[PDB]
Structure formats: C-alpha cells, structure tokens
Design brief:
It is an enzyme of class 3 (hydrolase). The chain is mostly beta strands and 330 residues long. It has four helices and 24 strands. It binds [4-(trifluoromethyl)phenyl]methanamine (2 copies).
Length: 330
C-alpha cells in the first residue's frame, strides 16, 4: 500500500507545515504537524482544558465507533523549544492520504503549553522519529510509520516541503518525477532515537567548500537550521551589518540586505539553500531588523537540519532494517 498527502505552510514565513489526517470512524479530519524529530501522535481533543483551546479542531473519541481507551496509559512530552503537553491515550483508526492504520495510539491532550494554544492552525503533531522516543507509559507505543511499515510497498516516506508553497509527504514509494539528478543516501544512527546523520561540510555563497563533519538530525518539526557556532559565524560574516543579538536571541540582519546561499554536503553531493530561504522577516512589525534562518546550535546540544534546509531538497526517510537518509536536489 501507499499514501500521499499535501502539506501546507501555516503562515507566510513557513514557520511550520500542516497535513490533513483522518482519525476515527466516521473520519474526523485534523491538521497535524508531521515531526521527524519526535515520536508521539497527539491531538487537541474534547478532553483538553477548555481555556487552553483557541480555534483548534478537536478530536472527540466519544463520537468514534472505533476509538478504544488504552486503560492506564498516560503520556507527557517536552520539546526542545520548551513546549510541552500531556494526557491519556486512545487507539483508533488513522489514515494519511489513503494509507490506513488500525489500532494506532492517538494521544489525547488534557494539558498543552501556551505556545500550542496560541497556534490556531496546528491541531496536533504526528511523530515520525523512531518509536524508542515515544512517551506513552507504562506501555510504549509505535509511531504511525512503524505501524504502517509492513504493509507499505517500500518501508520509506519522503518529505518534499515547499518554499512559500504546498508540498507533499509520500508513504511507501519514491516519486522519481519530484527531484532532479540522483538521490544520495547517507548512513543514519538511531542511537538517540532521531534521524541522525553526518553532513560532509558546507560553503557560504560562492565560496570554497569546507570539508568538515557536521553531525545533526533531519527534523521536519523544527523551523530553522541550527549549526555549530563556527559555521554560523562564517555565514553571517558575509552579510553586511549582521550581528548576534542577545535581546532578540540570535543573528539578525538589516532587512535591506541580500543574503548569500548556504550549501551543505551529503556524501559527495551538495544541497544549495537559496539565500531567500534564510530570511525570516522583521523581528517585530515595522522593524528594519530581520531574523536569520541559520542560527547557532551551541545552546541546544545537537545540530538540527530543520525546514530551512529540508525544503531545499527532496528527502527520503528509508526505514529499512538498516535505516538511511536520501537527499536529492529539486
Ligand atoms: N522536532 C522535535 C524536536 C525538538 C527539539 C529537539 C532537540 F532540541 F532535542 F534537538 C529534537 C526534536
Ligand atoms: N518540534 C516540535 C514542535 C513543533 C511545533 C511547535 C509549536 F510551533 F507549536 F510551538 C512546538 C514544537
């Protein structure tokens, strides 16, 4: 079997991408944030504290003939940005673009942090990292991808994120019409539960490529590109007037500047991020200081190839017994 669904930016800055997901019988359609950096499928629901819901579509398990409460199971998650949520667990039927999984763990939020309440466009998250990171207790649960794997034509999914435009998540097949040239595959470490890999180096604009190993994770759930301080300093040094601002919390640059591209290595291949992808607009309405899309990972503890990098490529998440990541230009 296969599945295919369109994913759409939630705002004019590509801060996140939402994908419609059908849950329950009859179907309740929610717009979820597909997150390859986490492994919980959780949703706003009829159980969520009423004051913490502001425009989201909610899952109502009592209206689903296939929902079953998972007795005694709870979940609680904290994301690297300080966001968090928690609740109880149902199993139900979940379908993504024609691909159906029965008995999927659907984690119903009882409590969500402020950053989720204020994001009216995101009804929940669909985690696509490895199931070892799932937070359900006392019985860990599998991700949508792990549950679907056996029935997929090929144990893969692909992310084709658009720049200020819709894109596609495909399950079970690789669309050879969606990219140019060849796909370059690179090894993955699952030791931390992430799609963790090693980039072979970088270049700034038309400058010389620097061969150096950068270990990081492919994370559709993170907006920006977070890289070591040395690399990020080298990039912003090429932008006139750019500086790191402690009050703003990262590199900013004059909105009138043109940004250089950023190249990262995948084996012997190169992925080029156009400079326009790195502009995240004024730091406040009306400001002439703009926020940069490449920031330092120093405070994080891990390098993150977020949407800024992934949307420049066609990305294959190969969940074979030895997992790999594939990158192609598009
Ligand atoms: N997108 C989920 C996510 C968020 C943060 C992190 C961090 F901070 F631990 F790297 C990993 C994964
Ligand atoms: N990395 C997972 C994640 C995705 C989105 C959000 C937001 F935008 F809702 F805050 C938090 C955490």
């Amino acid at each position: 079997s296969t599945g295919s669904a369109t994913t759409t930016p939630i705002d004019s800055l590509d801060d996140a991408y939402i994908t419609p997901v059908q849950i329950g019988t009859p179907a309740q359609t929610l717009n979820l944030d597909f997150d390859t950096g986490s492994s919980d499928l959780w949703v706003f629901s009829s159980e969520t504290t009423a004051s913490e819901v502001d425009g989201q579509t909610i899952y109502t398990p009592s209206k689903s003939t296939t929902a079953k409460l998972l007795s005694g199971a709870t979940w609680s998650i904290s994301y690297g940005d300080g966001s968090s949520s928690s609740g109880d667990v149902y199993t139900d039927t979940v379908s993504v673009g024609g691909l159906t999984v029965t008995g999927q763990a659907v984690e119903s939020a009882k409590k969500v942090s402020s950053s989720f309440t204020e994001d009216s466009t995101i009804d929940g998250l669909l985690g696509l990292a490895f199931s070892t990171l799932n937070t359900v207790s006392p019985t860990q649960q599998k991700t949508f991808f792990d549950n679907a794997k056996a029935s997929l034509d090929s144990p893969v999914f692909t992310a084709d994120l658009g720049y200020h435009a819709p894109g596609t998540y495909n399950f079970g097949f690789i669309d050879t019409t969606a990219y140019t040239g060849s796909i370059t595959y690179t090894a993955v470490s699952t030791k931390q539960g992430f799609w963790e890999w090693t980039s072979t180096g970088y270049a700034v604009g038309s400058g010389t490529f620097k061969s150096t190993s950068i270990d990081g994770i492919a994370d559709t759930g993170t907006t920006l590109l977070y890289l070591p301080a040395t690399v990020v300093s080298a990039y912003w040094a090429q932008v006139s007037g750019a500086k790191s601002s402690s009050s703003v919390g990262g590199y900013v640059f004059p909105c009138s500047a043109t940004l250089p591209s950023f190249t990262f290595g995948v084996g012997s291949a190169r992925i080029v991020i156009p400079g326009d992808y790195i502009d995240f607009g004024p730091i406040s309405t009306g400001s002439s200081s703009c926020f940069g899309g490449i920031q330092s990972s120093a405070g994080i503890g891990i390098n993150i190839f977020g949407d800024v990098a992934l949307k420049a490529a066609f990305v294959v998440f190969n969940g074979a017994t030895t997992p790999t990541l594939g990158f192609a230009s598009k």
